Design a protein around this ligand. Structure first.
Ligand SMILES: [Zn+2]
Ligand SMILES: [Zn+2]
Length: 259
């Protein structure tokens, strides 16, 4: 359980009261201004190696739903792009809106997408996620925008279990899932140094935000929107608009992998 949320009283505007790093120098998300984000030809190609992925559980954590992976060995890993070394996939989760016109955390020329998928990875130079979160290169989060259109067949297994995890703390087995089914065809990206977008807002993340959104259906996104922030029998707070808005870029540069 957790004290914070996305309401007027417990939401992003107030997180700095408990997490003063909320007003820090490398906070996420950010707007990606395509007039000022510059192509960097020294960026390597991004390497997604998810064939050996081992999914474990799906959980309503009170702010989102998350799907966890066995990160005890190099199985599903992210390498290349801006990264040095190997980063193991730990979990994925989403942020979404009440309406299709909002829901993403990152924006592109101020445009908000209907949702955003985060695949969270940690740097194996550290022992575990707990050590990695204390370092500036501890995590790599691969961010993928969702737009509404045709169904994403690789999302359907997720959508099909959401009715079983409606309220905070509900969970299920979630085995044999292939996260490659959530990727777009193109791996062109923007990258910058930032932070977790949820508490504790640690400044430990290399963000890799893909340019090409995936398409999901209205049925699929509606299932997201029928989840609850609350626990069982508590006053219903539909789980929508669980996104932090864009934060000041301060001294940073966003780099593009493409011209
Ligand atoms: Zn807790
Ligand atoms: Zn996230």
């Amino acid at each position: 359980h957790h004290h914070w949320g996305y309401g007027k009283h417990n939401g992003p505007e107030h997180w700095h009261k408990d997490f003063p790093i909320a007003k820090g120098e490398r906070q996420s998300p950010v707007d990606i201004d395509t007039h000022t984000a510059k192509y960097d030809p020294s960026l390597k190609p991004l390497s997604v190696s998810y064939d050996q992925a081992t999914s474990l559980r799906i959980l309503n954590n009170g702010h989102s739903f998350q799907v966890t992976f066995d990160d005890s060995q190099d199985k599903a890993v992210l390498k290349g792009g801006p990264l040095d070394g190997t980063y193991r996939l730990l979990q994925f989760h989403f942020h979404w809106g009440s309406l299709d016109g909002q829901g993403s955390e990152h924006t592109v020329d101020k445009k908000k997408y209907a949702a955003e998928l985060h695949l969270v990875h940690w740097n194996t130079k550290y022992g575990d996620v707990g050590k990695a979160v204390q370092q500036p290169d501890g995590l790599a989060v691969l961010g993928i925008f969702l737009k509404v259109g045709s169904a994403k067949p690789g999302l359907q297994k997720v959508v099909d279990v959401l009715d079983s995890i409606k309220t905070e703390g509900k969970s299920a087995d979630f085995t044999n899932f292939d996260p490659r089914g959530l990727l777009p065809e193109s791996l062109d990206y923007w990258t910058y140094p930032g932070s977790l977008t949820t508490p504790p807002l640690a400044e430990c993340v290399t963000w890799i935000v893909l340019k090409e959104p995936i398409s999901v259906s209205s049925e699929q996104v509606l299932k997201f929107r029928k989840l609850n922030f609350n626990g069982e029998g508590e006053p219903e707070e539909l789980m929508v608009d669980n996104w932090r808005p864009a934060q000041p870029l301060k001294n940073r540069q966003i780099k593009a992998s493409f011209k």
